[PDB]
Design a protein around this ligand. Structure first.
Ligand code: CL
Ligand code: CL
Ligand code: K
Length: 164
């Protein structure tokens, strides 16, 4: 298990434009195209992202390319985020993956919104952080996924992903 395998489990892989859990146009492995209601706008984003005129469909290789970019960006971003660096630097590799997962899903802003939980994490108060994380729109809207991430934070193991 690693960040890629983990996110691949959580986001799936779709080669044609689809709508994510929030109703937003997305493609590949959870690559958000735009929050716009416009399919045309989403297709324009796609083309720009890939570098060609696609008509809403990409190859797997293409999908993995955006995915690789997205995970890298996720990491790079956290590493230069003040609200997040310290807590992330404080974590072990497993829990770091969980943190990266949440940023990929919701963005730095969204993740920094979890101030209290982050703090318990920084304190290494595992169960407390776990409880706190669950008190969120995030957990209510994506409970299965949220529960998986929370277990990782709690335990520092990949068990929750262990057979997905
Ligand atoms: Cl992009
Ligand atoms: Cl879910
Ligand atoms: K998805």
């Amino acid at each position: 298990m690693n960040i890629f395998e983990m996110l691949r489990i959580d986001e799936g892989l779709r080669l044609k434009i689809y709508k994510d859990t929030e109703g937003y146009y997305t493609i590949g492995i959870g690559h958000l195209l735009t929050k716009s209601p416009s399919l045309n706008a989403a297709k324009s984003e796609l083309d720009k992202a890939i570098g060609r005129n696609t008509n809403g469909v990409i190859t797997k290789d293409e999908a993995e390319k955006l995915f690789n970019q997205d995970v890298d960006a996720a990491v790079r971003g956290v590493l230069r985020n003040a609200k997040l660096k310290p807590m992330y630097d404080s974590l072990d590799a497993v829990r770091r993956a969980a943190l990266i997962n949440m940023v990929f899903q919701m963005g730095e802003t969204g993740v920094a919104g979890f101030t209290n939980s982050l703090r318990y994490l920084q304190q290494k108060r595992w169960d407390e952080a776990a409880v706190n994380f669950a008190k969120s729109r995030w957990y209510n809207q994506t409970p299965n996924r949220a529960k998986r991430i929370i277990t990782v934070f709690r335990t520092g193991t990949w068990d929750a992903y262990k057979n997905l």
